Homo-oligomer: A and B are copies of this chain.
Amino acid sequence: FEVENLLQLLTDNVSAKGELENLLKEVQHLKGFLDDAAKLPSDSEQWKVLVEEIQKTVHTAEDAVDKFVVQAKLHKEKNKMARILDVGHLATVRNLAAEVKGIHDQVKELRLNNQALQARPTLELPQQGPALEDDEVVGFDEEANKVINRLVKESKDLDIIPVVGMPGLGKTTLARKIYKDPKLSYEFFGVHWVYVGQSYKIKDVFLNILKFFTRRTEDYQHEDVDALAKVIAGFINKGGRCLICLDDVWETKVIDYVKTIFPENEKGHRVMMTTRNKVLATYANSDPHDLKFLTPKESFELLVKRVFGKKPCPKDLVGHGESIAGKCGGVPLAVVVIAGALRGRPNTSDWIRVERNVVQHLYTNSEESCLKFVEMSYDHLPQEVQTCFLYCGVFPRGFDIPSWKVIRLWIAEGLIKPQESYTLEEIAEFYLNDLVNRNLVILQQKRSDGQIKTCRLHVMLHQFCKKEASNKWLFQEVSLTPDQAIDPNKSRRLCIQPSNLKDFLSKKPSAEHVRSFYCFSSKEKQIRGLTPNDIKLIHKAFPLVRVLDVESLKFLFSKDFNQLFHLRYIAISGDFNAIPLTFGKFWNLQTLILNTSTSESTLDVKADIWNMLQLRHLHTNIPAKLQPPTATTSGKASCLQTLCMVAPESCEKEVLAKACHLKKLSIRGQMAAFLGAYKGGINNLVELKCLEQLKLLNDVLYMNKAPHLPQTFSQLVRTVKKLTLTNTRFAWSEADKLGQLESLEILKFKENAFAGDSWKPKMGFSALRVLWIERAEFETWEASEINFPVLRNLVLMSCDKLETVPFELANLSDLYEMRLENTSKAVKSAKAILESKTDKNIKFNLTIFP
Contacts and interface: CB of A to CB of B under 8 A. Distances in A.
9 contacts: A44-B122, A116-B120, A252-B343, A347-B433, A353-B422, A353-B426, A360-B419, A423-B481, A483-B639
Given A43-B122, A114-B119, A424-B481, 19 more contacts: A3-B10, A6-B10, A25-B53, A28-B49, A29-B50, A29-B53, A31-B45, A32-B44, A32-B50, A36-B46, A46-B117, A46-B120, A47-B120, A85-B86, A252-B343, A252-B367, A253-B367, A282-B346, A349-B429
B115 A119 contact: yes
Among A225, A284, A420: residue with most chain B CB under 10 A: A420
A46 B35 contact: yes
Interface string A715-742: 0000000000000000000000000000
Interface of A: 1-4, 6-7, 10-11, 14, 25, 28-29, 31-33, 35-37, 40-50, 53, 84-87, 111-125, 127-131, 202, 225-226, 229, 252-253, 256-257, 259-260, 279-284, 286, 311, 315-316, 340, 343-347, 349-350, 353, 356-357, 360, 365, 367, 382, 418-424, 426, 429-430, 433, 450-451, 479, 481-484, 486, 503, 506, 613, 636-637, 639, 661, 790, 814
Nearest to A430: B353
A35 B10 CA distance: 43
Nearest to A53: B25
Contact of A252 (B2, B37, B340, B356): B340
Among A2, A44, A636, A661: residue with most chain B CB under 10 A: A44
Contacts of A483: 613, 636-637, 639
B349 A430 contact: yes
Contacts of A130: 253, 256-257, 259-260
B3 A4 contact: no
B484 A418 contact: yes
Nearest to A451: B349
A42 B353 contact: no
A421 B350 contact: no
B36 A44 contact: yes
B430 A482 contact: no
Contacts of A112: 113
Contact of A3 (B7, B86, B357, B424): B7
Contacts of A35: 45-46
Among A36, A424, A506: residue with most chain B CB under 10 A: A36
Contacts of A229: 131
B226 A131 contact: yes
Given A33-B46, A115-B118, A130-B260, A311 B286 contact: yes
Nearest to A507: B636
Closest 9 CB pairs of A and B: A283-B344, A32-B46, A85-B85, A32-B49, A116-B119, A282-B344, A35-B45, A279-B344, A32-B45
A486 B365 contact: no
Given A125-B122, A226-B131, A311-B286, A418 B37 contact: no
B33 A121 contact: no
A41 B124 CA distance: 13
Given A28-B49, A356-B421, A260 B131 contact: yes
A43 B121 CA distance: 8
Nearest to A635: B506
A14 B7 contact: no
B421 A481 contact: yes
Contact of A316 (B340, B484, B639, B790): B790
B225 A128 contact: yes
Given A50-B119, A130-B257, A257-B130, A486 B382 contact: no
Contact of A482 (B1, B282, B639): B639
A45 B35 CA distance: 7
A433 B350 contact: yes
Contact of A422 (B25, B356, B503, B636): B356
Contact of A343 (B7, B127, B283): B283
B119 A481 contact: no
A315 B814 contact: yes
Contact of A279 (B29, B343, B482): B343
A37 B121 contact: yes
Contact of A129 (B256, B382, B429): B256
Among A114, A346, A421, A482: residue with most chain B CB under 10 A: A482
Contacts of A120: 44, 46-47, 116
Contacts of A50: 29, 32, 119
Nearest to A109: B108
Nearest to A88: B84
